[PDB]
Amino acid sequence: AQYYPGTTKVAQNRRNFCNPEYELEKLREISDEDVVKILGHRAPGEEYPSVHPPLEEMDEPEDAIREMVEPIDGAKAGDRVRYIQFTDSMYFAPAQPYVRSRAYLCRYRGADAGTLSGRQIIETRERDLEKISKELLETEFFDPARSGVRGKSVHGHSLRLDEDGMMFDMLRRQIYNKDTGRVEMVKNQIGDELDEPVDLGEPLDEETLMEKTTIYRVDGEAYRDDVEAVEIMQRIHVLRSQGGFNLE
């Protein structure tokens, strides 16, 4: 698979995020309880609430497709569908909204990915969501300063940074500690206070952000300079136009 055209670092990073054979760099280690705490759908050690009975307790209709498509564990169990949502600063956050959705549906099964200017979301079975969330939080998908976990009040992707380089958060779920140089998540994605904050590590250096970012910018790599990437987008525009008319 080629995934995406272009000869810039951005284009390559976009290809890497989609390529399931590319190993996302692990930049931090997060405990399973911390993931459950960040998600905020249940308490650590709380039973998985069920939206419907287990699939084996149900008698699904004989259906060649059902028999050929292995359900994810959370669907077998009847888990609810919950979410994790990220905001990505346009100031060189490693992951961006379109990059996420494309990469999610290349990497993860049974994924409902949504892309917006200030938020990107995935909904799936709860227990499966937690393992996806661990990777999305531990790897280069996420930077503790230029990315934020936000179930609501996502304002900030387009705002200026604060004095510490942190992205704006109306609810301040992620607190930069000027005494230690590390970021802590005081509250959960929906904004509810946590009992024990979650260390999210040190923000990436400005130089490393540009190394890993997937956004084009004039003060980084400009999209207009990735001529081959622009050319494919124009090609798609032209071929779409000709197909819709189809009377040449």
Partner: protein, 547 residues
């Protein structure tokens, strides 16, 4: 400097280029004069009615960032965004009322019935007499029966009937009080075009009372107009008050020579005539009167149409008719505040002017690829070079509509054809989405992914020149950040060409009228005046209510 630099400096402490600021220390809603007014109002309102209402402690705390003032484009008026909410802005409400309560009705079939079926003569003398009768009758007063109860003249003072005709001799014969003089309201070349389009036809511009339009709906307009036309025809031309021929006048006034502002809508968005969803983009461009005063600046003309359409289509139509609540004041403000779209569009006009000259570019995909790509990159680069600008138009959808509108309008400036301008609009979205790995909200580019393929399609519910498209075009029926910009793109090629109208010359003339309440020659100036609570609307009931 950039046309938006002034607004950015008056909005934030930092210089527009600065990349960092400080938050959380502004006091929340207390930073804002308007939010403070709202908090006190909610306290008085809740106490008075016995039910909690506006409460800043509900939900999340507004104002962790700067609550920005907005410059209304082409003005020096700065207001908080709440002052541009249509509910808080009487000028915006009156703009829609003046459209909703307007219908165009020919007199040509009617005069033929008079002479052919009734065997009576129609002359400029009888037309004037009819017009004096209909201006008594149209606001809701009687001309034939005894013991009729009528509307209070002061409550319906904004209702009247005027006529226009391309025949200068007939126009001079009619009392000027009832005449929209094409020669006096349009420059010479435009007036000659408009008069040639109308010829010997005689057309009424009917405006029913704002108070009725607000009590009832848009489908009321053409019916109300027809009743009083019919009553005045009975009176002025001395027919029997209800004979066979009376029906011919009603059919002609209600169907045969009537021009609605908007056509009715299908069931899922069930609505009668003269609602915003039925107004095609070409009509909206022609309702806006910038073309006849700013004709030497095609950017100004085009963007006044954008402001007209963005407010009506996004704030009132999509933001209330089709949804409601807080609504989409900001989705629309992006297209007519801070001089941002003006900067992007003047750049595109200049780029097209240096490379092709307006209207001299080939009307093909080569021109679309050239102009829309260059202007898109210019627009997006401003958001990157100025952090303040990006924080100002914080919504991806806002930036998409503004950048693509400049790209679309620019392409149409080059080709003189609105359809290639529309192709440029969609090309801008595809580039924008790829440059920043984001575009608008969850469902912003439904029409934009259908866009390219449907620009030049010819199939049943796909193919249509942009001027004929409107809020009911299938792809367009749902989403903010397009419809008002489409009206701009529709105007774009005609403004470059010097055309007197985009799609309908009768609609163009019908709003070149100094007796309208809203001044359609200066839409954005009017919005600013409403924001300052300096606009006096029609339709108020103060006269019939206690002090």
């Amino acid at each position: 400097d950039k046309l938006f630099i002034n607004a950015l400096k008056k909005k934030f402490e930092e210089s527009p280029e600065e990349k960092k600021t400080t938050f959380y220390t502004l006091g929340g809603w207390k930073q804002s004069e308007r939010k403070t007014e709202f908090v006190n109002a909610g306290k008085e309102v809740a106490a008075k009615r016995g039910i909690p209402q506006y409460n800043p402690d509900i939900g999340t705390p507004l104002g962790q960032r700067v609550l920005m003032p907005y410059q209304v484009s082409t003005t020096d008026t700065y207001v908080e965004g709440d002052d541009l909410h249509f509910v808080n802005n009487a000028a915006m409400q009156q703009m829609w009322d003046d459209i909703r309560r307007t219908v165009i009705v020919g007199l040509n079939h009617a005069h033929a019935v008079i002479e052919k079926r009734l065997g009576k003569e129609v002359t400029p003398e009888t037309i004037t007499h009819y017009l004096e009768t209909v201006n008594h009758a149209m606001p809701g007063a009687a001309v034939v029966q005894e013991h009729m109860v009528e509307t209070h003249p002061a409550l319906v003072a904004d209702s009247y009937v005027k006529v226009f005709t391309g025949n200068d001799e007939i126009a001079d014969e009619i009392d000027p009080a009832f005449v929209i003089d094409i020669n006096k309201q349009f420059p010479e070349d435009q007036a000659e075009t408009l008069k040639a389009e109308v010829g010997d036809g005689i057309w009424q511009v009917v405006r029913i009372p704002t108070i009725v339009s607000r009590t009832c709906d848009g489908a009321t307009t053409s019916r109300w107009s027809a009743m009083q036309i019919g009553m005045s025809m009975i009176s002025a031309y001395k027919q029997a008050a209800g004979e066979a021929a009376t029906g011919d006048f009603a059919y002609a006034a209600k169907h045969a020579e009537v021009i609605h502002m908007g056509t009715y809508l299908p069931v899922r968005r069930a609505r009668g005539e003269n609602e915003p969803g039925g107004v095609p983009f070409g009509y909206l461009a022609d309702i806006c009167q910038s073309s006849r005063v700013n004709y030497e600046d095609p950017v100004r003309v085009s963007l006044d149409v954008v402001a007209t359409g963005a407010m009506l289509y996004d704030q009132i139509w999509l933001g209330s008719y089709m949804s409601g609540g807080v609504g989409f004041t900001q989705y629309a403000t992006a297209a007519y505040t801070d001089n941002i779209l003006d900067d992007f569009t003047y750049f595109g006009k200049e780029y097209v002017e240096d490379k092709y000259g307006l209207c001299e570019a080939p009307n093909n995909m080569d021109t679309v690829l050239d102009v829309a790509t260059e202007v898109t990159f210019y627009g997006l680069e401003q958001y990157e070079e100025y952090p303040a600008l990006l924080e100002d138009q914080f919504g991806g959808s806002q930036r998409a509509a503004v950048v693509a509108a400049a790209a679309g309008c620019s392409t149409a400036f080059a080709t003189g054809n609105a359809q290639t301008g529309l192709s440029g609009w969609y090309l801008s979205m595809y580039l924008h989405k790829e440059q920043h790995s984001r575009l608008g909200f969850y469902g912003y580019d439904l029409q934009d992914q259908c866009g390219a393929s449907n620009v030049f399609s010819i199939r049943g519910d796909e193919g249509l020149p942009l001027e004929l498209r409107g809020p009911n075009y299938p792809n367009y029926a749902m989403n903010v950040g397009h419809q008002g910009e489409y009206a701009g793109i529709s105007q774009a090629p005609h403004a470059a060409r010097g055309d007197a109208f985009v799609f309908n010359p009768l609609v163009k003339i019908a709003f070149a009228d100094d007796n309208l309440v809203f001044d359609f020659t200066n839409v954005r100036g009017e919005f600013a005046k409403g924001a300052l609570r300096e606009f006096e609307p029609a339709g108020e009931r103060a006269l019939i209510t206690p002090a």
